[PDB]
């Protein structure tokens, strides 16, 4: 009868370009289904170099062109973001190396840590890559970030 405001938080080194797309996406997914009033999704950089580094001019006009709604600052995830959110996942990249051992030093951590995987489909597709360069490839990543939060919103629907 009473729905709950589920909470999720994506994380991944370099929150600029190929990364912050799955985040702004989870928003467009929670804002198109009377589901935005029941979710606490946020982004997580995990570093202190991209703290406040808005998306690059390349991934900024893209997510802000098809309709993604991006009104949040990367900022470096903190114990508050951990215990706060409950679904702290990441774009694979560093196979749960830090975030996994991050809740260990978190003052009372409660953010289940994990990395995107097979949700809607059933194939083993993981983002075990450092980057894709910059030219000759960019819109493909933003597209892979669509289900990054939607395909996952199905399990925590």
């Amino acid at each position: 009868a009473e729905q709950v405001t589920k909470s999720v938080l994506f994380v991944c080194l370099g929150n600029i370009c190929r990364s912050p797309i799955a985040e702004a996406v989870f928003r467009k997914l929670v804002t198109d289904q009377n589901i935005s009033d029941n979710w606490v999704i946020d982004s997580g950089a995990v570093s202190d170099w991209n703290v406040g580094r808005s998306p690059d001019p390349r991934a900024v006009s893209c997510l802000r062109n098809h309709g993604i709604n991006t009104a949040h600052k990367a900022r470096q995830v903190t114990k508050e973001d951990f215990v706060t959110f409950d679904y702290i996942l990441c774009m694979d990249e560093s196979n749960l190396r830090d975030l996994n051992r991050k809740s260990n030093q978190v003052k009372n951590c409660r953010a289940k840590i994990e990395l995107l995987g097979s949700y809607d489909p059933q194939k083993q597709l993981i983002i075990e890559d450092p980057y894709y360069g910059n030219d000759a490839d960019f819109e493909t990543v933003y597209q892979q970030c669509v289900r990054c939060c939607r395909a996952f919103l199905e399990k925590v629907r």
Side-chain angles (χ1 to χ4, degrees):
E2 321 197 23
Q3 280 157 252
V4 202
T5 24
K6 217 156 292 204
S7 302
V8 33
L9 162 127
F10 264 129
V11 194
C12 147
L13 211 97
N15 184 273
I16 62 104
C17 189
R18 173 228 165 286
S19 142
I21 323 311
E23 264 121 336
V25 173
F26 202 118
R27 204 113 220 150
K28 179 78 233 239
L29 300 164
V30 81
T31 333
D32 219 355
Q33 227 68 87
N34 219 279
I35 166 158
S36 224
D37 200 335
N38 265 289
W39 265 107
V40 175
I41 307 119
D42 264 41
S43 57
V46 101
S47 262
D48 172 77
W49 335 320
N50 311 260
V51 174
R53 267 193 99 318
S54 277
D56 248 331
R58 278 217 116 216
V60 74
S61 41
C62 301
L63 92 173
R64 186 133 72 101
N65 167 278
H66 292 234
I68 204 94
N69 300 259
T70 156
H72 178 104
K73 215 78 64 36
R75 272 282 232 312
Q76 175 198 292
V77 188
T78 353
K79 167 257 145 173
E80 179 81 33
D81 297 57
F82 289 98
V83 70
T84 288
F85 312 122
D86 239 62
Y87 310 157
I88 277 206
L89 329 117
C90 22
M91 288 299 118
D92 170 49
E93 175 194 66
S94 42
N95 53 349
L96 254 180
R97 195 195 142 186
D98 245 294
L99 280 185
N100 216 66
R101 238 276 201 48
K102 169 48 69 219
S103 96
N104 249 247
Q105 60 150 259
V106 168
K107 173 82 148 86
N108 205 66
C109 227
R110 108 191 267 157
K112 265 181 165 229
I113 332 285
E114 246 138 325
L115 47 155
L116 238 107
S118 36
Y119 279 126
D120 256 62
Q122 296 203 269
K123 34 179 63 174
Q124 51 259 112
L125 207 114
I126 279 290
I127 328 303
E128 264 210 48
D129 269 299
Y131 248 128
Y132 308 131
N134 231 302
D135 305 33
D137 43 65
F138 216 80
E139 51 149 351
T140 307
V141 166
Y142 160 104
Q143 254 128 97
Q144 256 271 317
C145 265
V146 176
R147 314 108 119 131
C148 263
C149 35
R150 200 198 179 238
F152 153 96
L153 158 66
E154 299 261 72
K155 249 296 121 141
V156 286
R157 219 261 287 191

